[PDB]
Scaffold this active site. Sequence first.
Site, short mmCIF file in Angstrom:
data_model
loop_
_atom_site.label_atom_id
_atom_site.label_comp_id
_atom_site.label_asym_id
_atom_site.label_seq_id
_atom_site.Cartn_x
_atom_site.Cartn_y
_atom_site.Cartn_z
N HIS A 30 5.15 5.44 11.75
CA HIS A 30 6.45 4.83 11.43
C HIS A 30 7.66 5.78 11.76
CE1 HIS A 30 5.58 0.77 10.62
NE2 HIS A 30 5.20 0.94 9.32
N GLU A 37 1.87 5.46 7.82
CA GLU A 37 3.20 5.69 7.24
C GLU A 37 3.99 6.96 8.40
OE1 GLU A 37 4.70 3.72 5.50
OE2 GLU A 37 2.52 2.89 5.25
N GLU A 90 5.36 -2.71 13.14
CA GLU A 90 4.00 -2.87 12.62
C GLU A 90 2.64 -2.88 13.33
OE1 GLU A 90 3.98 -1.94 9.49
OE2 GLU A 90 5.94 -2.45 8.80
N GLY A 136 0.86 -1.28 -0.05
CA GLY A 136 -0.03 -0.03 -0.01
C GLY A 136 0.69 1.28 -0.11
N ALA A 137 1.88 1.13 0.66
CA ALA A 137 3.01 2.32 1.02
C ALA A 137 3.95 1.92 1.72
CB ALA A 137 2.07 3.31 1.91
#
EC number: 3.4.11.-
Length: 856
Positions: A313, A310, A332, A273-274
């Site tokens: 993260h 994102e 994650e 996805g990214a």
Amino acid sequence: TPFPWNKIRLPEYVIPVHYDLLIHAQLTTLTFWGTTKVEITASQPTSTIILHSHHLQISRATLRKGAGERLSEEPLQVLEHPRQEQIALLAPEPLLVGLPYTVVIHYAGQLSETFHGFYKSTYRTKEGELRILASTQFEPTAARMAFPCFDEPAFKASFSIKIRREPRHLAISNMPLVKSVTVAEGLIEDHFDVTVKMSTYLVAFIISDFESVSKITKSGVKVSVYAVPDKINQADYALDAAVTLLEFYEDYFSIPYPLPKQDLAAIPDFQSGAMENWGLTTYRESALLFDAEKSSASSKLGITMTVAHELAHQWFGNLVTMEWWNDLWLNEGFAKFMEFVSVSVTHPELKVGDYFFGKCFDAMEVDALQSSHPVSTPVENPAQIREMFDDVSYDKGACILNMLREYLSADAFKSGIVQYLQKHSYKNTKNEDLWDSMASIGVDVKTMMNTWTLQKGFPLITITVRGRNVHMKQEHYMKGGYLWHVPLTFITSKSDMVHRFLLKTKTDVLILPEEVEWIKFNVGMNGYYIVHYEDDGWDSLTGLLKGTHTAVSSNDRASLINNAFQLVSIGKLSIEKALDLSLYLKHETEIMPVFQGLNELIPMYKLMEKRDMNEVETQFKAFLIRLLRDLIDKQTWTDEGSVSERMLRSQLLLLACVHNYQPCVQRAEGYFRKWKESNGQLSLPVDVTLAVFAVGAQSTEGWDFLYSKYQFSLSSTEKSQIEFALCRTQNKEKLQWLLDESFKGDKIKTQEFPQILTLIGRNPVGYPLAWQFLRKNWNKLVQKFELGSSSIAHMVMGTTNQFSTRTRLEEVKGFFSSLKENGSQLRCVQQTIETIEENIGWMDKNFDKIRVWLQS
Ligand SMILES: C[C@@H]1C[C@H](O)[C@@]2(C)C(C(=O)O)=CCC[C@@H]2[C@@]1(C)CCc1ccoc1
Ligand SMILES: [Zn+2]
């Protein structure tokens, strides 16, 4: 000449401190050249440097000591061990301990034709011109395909990137552009600022003709969205969301974002996805780009959640990184969980907290099987590492963190997070580091969380009530000596306050202050466990749902539906009693219990579609429509209401149309005919488009018309809606064409192939074609997507996990066992085999019971 290193893991006595990466990609020939200069120190004497390199042609390697006048260079002889993806650099003399040296490597490679390493991406302008760009995707082990390095996440270092490119192209990387210098051969060399200390997997660089839009945060960070010129007008939503979320995280963690800028780049070809590259986050165009007229409410929610993921993260993964992939969940599980924490605050109209428990049910699907793995589990090779990017690391990881937060309270959990992030900033962590941080605020944290991370699966909690005495028992839930510290929660008919009880033992008892009419455990499904009620418990809770379903929250109703069907699978509740409970859904109005109902009931007929069960399949589908008929009939054919109202509407109309509910089919046919006669110029409500397109694609003219509009669409939602509709055709030549085209990447990009394969795998007439296609084209699919990738796992499960006969089981076992080292040991293969075994047993036991129940 034997290779002087026999381990997959690198020696730990040669440490990098800084990399200088010079890259020149030739977009016309798809060749790239590089010069890597890595500053190292050795803690023990060695004349040998082992590092990672994969598919790189090394022309020269030298070892430097000192600078300027006091500079020494020495030639390095190069040896390769391609299977271990390593190179050995041989010095004419040993390196002096604790002294800095610079390894200089000149090399060339070909731009990858996959979605990893330094790879080729393409798009067509609205005028039909093909455009070529080069982008990177290194997580987990592909940095070694772009530059030789110590490619393990604990070998942190700073990176100074330099890109040589044509004046007509733009280059972007992790850090701001500090200077562009004219070099020879009509090229420009862009110099990007030095990064903070980070893992090699976070390095990123893009050479393209992208356009950008920017906005500054209140902390002065320049946030930019990059995309192809034809799509940059769809960047504004993500740009606003990114600014708001970055500010949220800085305020929340009390740790500022350390870089001067944050870029969000929409890549025309992207596998996952990214990706969270520090300062240069990358996305599939569908995960970032919003069209205010054509995008769905679900796509808008998806973008917000992906940007939130994102950006989380940047702290959980970049600033603090797991020491090794066995603990990938530290990155994650936290990033998945933080999407919900952040968006609940920034976008309270999206009501995301209410959807969280759905992630836990997703994790339970895989985690109920013998082939699941503990959250923290050993891994060594790249395929095993890629297998860690799964629902256990992401969803179970987030769910056990949510469970811990509810147990500790949000403030004690937050203090723990902040202490953890501060103490381990620019460093690496293991599980014990997280517990030590959480406990420093939480006396039982280490013992409790080790039960949730070092054991696979989850417990079944059994409840038996004798007057005021509530007996509790835990046991490992297994489909067909585990012990946890379970933070139980409950409400009763006398108290809607959330009560807490920590079950640390096999059995315990709690004494209620006064007798109650009913008790319901796992309030709002915040716990990673399921519950069984003895005696008249299930009859009682069924009665509660049928009389006053509002007596418990929407998520509590969804948790009851899910657990009742999970109990059928282990023989604790009959299929008749779970189906009797599902009848309460005739009066349900809320999205989560309605969707939970569909999540339990749809798989039953998906098994029947692949068998000689036409009569029971038709009656089961008619029962499902009859059950939700009042709710379906109430739906308006508009884009009105909240995000939840819009998503509920879209899925109800699609379900009704797929199962030939005549009022919805006739209406869908009308919209399609009118839309087609206007040459697709007339606007259809986005919420009805899936249903309308699925119906329209049932004719050759309709399918062809939809396909003609696909080629010109700039909308990710519209393309996804057309792909879905086209995959629902019952014309096998068109289904084969879709598989062939997306596999080739011509008319439909290969990034869509895994979803297309799954959709056809689920098609009532196309399912044999998808399984056959996967078998025949396996090698090329593995080369494109990689063994162990989530994409391959989804392709494996998507084509086989709805089979329910011994003949189908042997086809699967036989095929995958024949692959030997090229897939026979995939975890997804063991998971699908176990799923088919469960399907065989479930159908043999319950098919006739369902047949009888439907007649009554
Ligand atoms: C994911 C599903 C796959 C499933 O194959 C599918 C296509 C289906 C079918 O094949 O019969 C009929 C209804 C829609 C459904 C879904 C996309 C949606 C289910 C749904 C919505 C809301 O909660 C569950
Ligand atoms: Zn992530």
